[PDB]
Amino acid sequence: HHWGYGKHNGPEHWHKDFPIAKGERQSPVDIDTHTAKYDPSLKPLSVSYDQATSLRILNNGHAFNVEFDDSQDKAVLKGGPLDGTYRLIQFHFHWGSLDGQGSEHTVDKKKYAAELHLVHWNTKYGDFGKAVQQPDGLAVLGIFLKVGSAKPGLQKVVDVLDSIKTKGKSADFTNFDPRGLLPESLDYWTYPGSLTTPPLLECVTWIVLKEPISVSSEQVLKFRKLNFNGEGEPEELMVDNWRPAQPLKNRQIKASFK
Numbered sequence: 001h002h003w004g005y006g007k008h009n010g011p012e013h014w015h016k017d018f019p020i021a022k023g024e025r026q027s028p029v030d031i032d033t034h035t036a037k038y039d040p041s042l043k044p045l046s047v048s049y050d051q052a053t054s055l056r057i058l059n060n061g062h063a064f065n066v067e068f069d070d071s072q073d074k075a076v077l078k079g080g081p082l083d084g085t086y087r088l089i090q091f092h093f094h095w096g097s098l099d100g101q102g103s104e105h106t107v108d109k110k111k112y113a114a115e116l117h118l119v120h121w122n123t124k125y126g127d128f129g130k131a132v133q134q135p136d137g138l139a140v141l142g143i144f145l146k147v148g149s150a151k152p153g154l155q156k157v158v159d160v161l162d163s164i165k166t167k168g169k170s171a172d173f174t175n176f177d178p179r180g181l182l183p184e185s186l187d188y189w190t191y192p193g194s195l196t197t198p199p200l201l202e203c204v205t206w207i208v209l210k211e212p213i214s215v216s217s218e219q220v221l222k223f224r225k226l227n228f229n230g231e232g233e234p235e236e237l238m239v240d241n242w243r244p245a246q247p248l249k250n251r252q253i254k255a256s257f258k
């Protein structure tokens with residue numbers, strides 16, 4: 001009886017196995033754009049993905065992850081609210097059953113069709129597993145998806161999903177350039193938070209870009225053909241793999257822009 005996103009094992013149940021689910025810095029949150037304050041102390045954000053080395057794509061039963069080689073400083077996130085160097089390890093998405101829901105963060109209570117999470121770890125902790133035990137261990141770059149024009153840089157991901165339909169399937173996924181998933185502007189909001197899935201560790205600096213990317217209805221329809229289940233088990237479509245907004249508590253969301 002493992003965690004997931006069903007009626008019986010979904011987000012409102014997670015606190016029984018992961019009591020930090022009711023903690024002081026949980027994610028995601030609603031970004032109230034009128035209360036977020038411009039912070040002129042935020043240094044410029046530096047996304048350096050030219051040397052990124054993707055390896056594999058995996059269906060892990062709750063999303064699909066594109067994994068990178070993080071054994072040197074090839075693809076790094078720096079600047080903005082961050083002290084030091086954060087190495088890209090994986091990206092994944094959260095999405096809905098319908099275009100009106102799917103994002104984890106909300107903007108003035110608006111839900112987007114999906115949300116991309118580019119996950120990075122603080123290299124001063126030596127490995128990812130050590131970094132997730134630290135309050136500044138991870139930086140997650142969050143990017144909203146809206147349905148409109150296709151995102152050409154997404155299509156190589158969309159086209160491999162048929163090969164990883166079910167939990168535990170992986171496929172080789174080399175030479176994928178995550179720069180193709182970025183919007184034009186790097187204007188962002190930032191706050192301290194958590195992983196949005198169990199174990200819900202409070203180790204994340206969140207950086208959520210204001211500008212959504214556009215993907216086509218056919219692109220997001222292909223995400224919704226994935227399965228939560230393993231091969232040879234009852235088919236359960238991988239949809240609505242998002243945690244709703246959590247209480248902000250004693251936190252301020254800062255804006256990089258006026």
Ligand SMILES: NS(=O)(=O)c1ccc(CCNC(=S)N2CC(=O)N3CCc4ccccc4[C@@H]3C2)cc1
Pocket residue numbers: 065067068070089090117119128129140194195196197
């Ligand atoms: N939705 S979210 O953005 O808040 C979020 C971000 C990150 C996580 C943790 C997911 N775990 C992840 S992504 N892990 C587990 C692990 O120990 N290793 C470390 C070793 C390794 C090496 C190469 C490539 C991958 C890995 C995995 C990655 C969970 C949730």
Ligand SMILES: [Zn+2]
Pocket residue numbers: 092093094117196
């Ligand atoms: Zn995520």
